[PDB]
C-alpha cells in the first residue's frame, strides 16, 4: 500500500488523584485502600492507581514517539479503584474532565473515539439506559471531536457512532458494553437495553450499504476471560446476541477493540461454519494495580495500529510500556517498544485468517508462540512468569472460541 494509517489505542488509565510520595506507604494512594504500597515511586506502584505523572508520560511518549496518527481510540475506565463511598458523581466527571482536558491540550488538532468504561458511572458499573447526568458531560466534553448526530445518542445511552475526519469511509462505533456487565443491576431481565443491540444492527446495515468499513470500540469486550473457566465479562445473554450481529456483519467490520481486562489478548471471532471472520484485541491497561494477593498485574501499555487506508484492513501493531521498576528506579520515563506484531510472531498482517494460524500454533506442545503471548499477556511484568497446563487451556480456548457451545466444546 502506497501510504500507511496509524491510529492510537489507550485504555484503563484510571487516575488515582490522590499519589503522593509519602514515609506512610499506607498513605500513598487511596487506591491501596490501606495496604501498604509495595515500593512506591514517581511513576506509581503495583498496588496504586496511576499517578497524573504516570498518564502524562504516556502522553508525552506518545508526542514524542516520532509516530504519525489520523486519530486515537480511548476505551475508557478514568476513575481510580477506591470503594464506592469514596467518589462520587461530581469527582467521577471532574476526573473524567481532567483525562479528556489533558488529551485535548496536548493534541488540538487529532481526532479522538472514546467510549465509557465500567468505571466512568458512579456507583460503578450501574450505568443506565436512559439519559444521565455522566452522559450528558461527557457528550459536553467530548463535542470537539464527534457530530451531533454522535452527540445526541450519546447522551440517551452512552454509545455512538462517528465517521473519522480523515477517512470519511471508515466508521468508528462506540458500544457501551458496561450495559451488559454482569455486576450491571440496572439491566437486568432488559431484552435490549438502551436499544443498542437495535441501534448497532441498523448502524452496521447503513455501513455495509454506504460503501463504509467499521471499527467496534467498547469498554468490557465480548467472550471469555482468559484466566478463568466458563467466566465471560458480559452475561451470556448478551455475549451470544453480539456474537451473532457481529457474524452478520463480520464483512463490514474490519476490527474490533476493547479494554478492561488490563491484559494483552487477542480473539478471533468465527462465522456460524468455523471459520474465522473478525479479529478482536484487547489492549492492556496504563495504570498498573492490582491486589496484594495477585502475583502478576501489567506493566503500563500504549500501543499503535497500522491500517490500510484504501479498504481499513489492519496491517500491524505495536505495543509500547514502561518498565515500572525501571523508570521508578531511575526516576526517568523510558517508554519502549514490547513488540511488533507481524514481526515477534511471523505472520503477514492482523488479518482472521492470520490471528488464527497464530492460536493454532499456540495449541503446540511446548508451543514458544504461546510462552511469549503469555509473556506479553501481562506486558512482560515478569520474564520468568510460567504457565500451567489448565491455564493454557483456558487461555487458548478463550482466544478462539466466543460462544458458549464453542468454549465448552474447548
Ligand atoms: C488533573 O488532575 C491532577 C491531579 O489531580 C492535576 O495535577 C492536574 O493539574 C489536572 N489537570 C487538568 C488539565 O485539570
Ligand atoms: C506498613 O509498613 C509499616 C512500616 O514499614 C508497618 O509497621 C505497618 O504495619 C504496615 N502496614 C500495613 C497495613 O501493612
Ligand atoms: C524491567 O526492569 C528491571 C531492571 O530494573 C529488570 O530486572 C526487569 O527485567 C525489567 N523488565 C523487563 C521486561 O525486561
Ligand atoms: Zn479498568
Ligand atoms: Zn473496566
Redo the contacts with the bound molecule.
Sequence with gaps: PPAIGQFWHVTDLHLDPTYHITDD??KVCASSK???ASNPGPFGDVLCDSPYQLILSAFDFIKNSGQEASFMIWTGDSPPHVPVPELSTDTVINVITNMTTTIQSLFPNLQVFPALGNHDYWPQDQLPVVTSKVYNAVANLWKPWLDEEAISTLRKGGFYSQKVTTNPNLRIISLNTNLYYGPNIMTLNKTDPANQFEWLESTLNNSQQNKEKVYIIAHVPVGYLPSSQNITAMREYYNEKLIDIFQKYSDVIAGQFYGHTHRDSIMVLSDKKGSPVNSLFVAPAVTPVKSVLEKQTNNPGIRLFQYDPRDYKLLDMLQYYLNLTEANLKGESIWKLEYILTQTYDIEDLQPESLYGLAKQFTILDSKQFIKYYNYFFVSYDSSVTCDKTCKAFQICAIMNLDNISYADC
Design positions: 506507604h499506607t490501606g495496604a501498604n
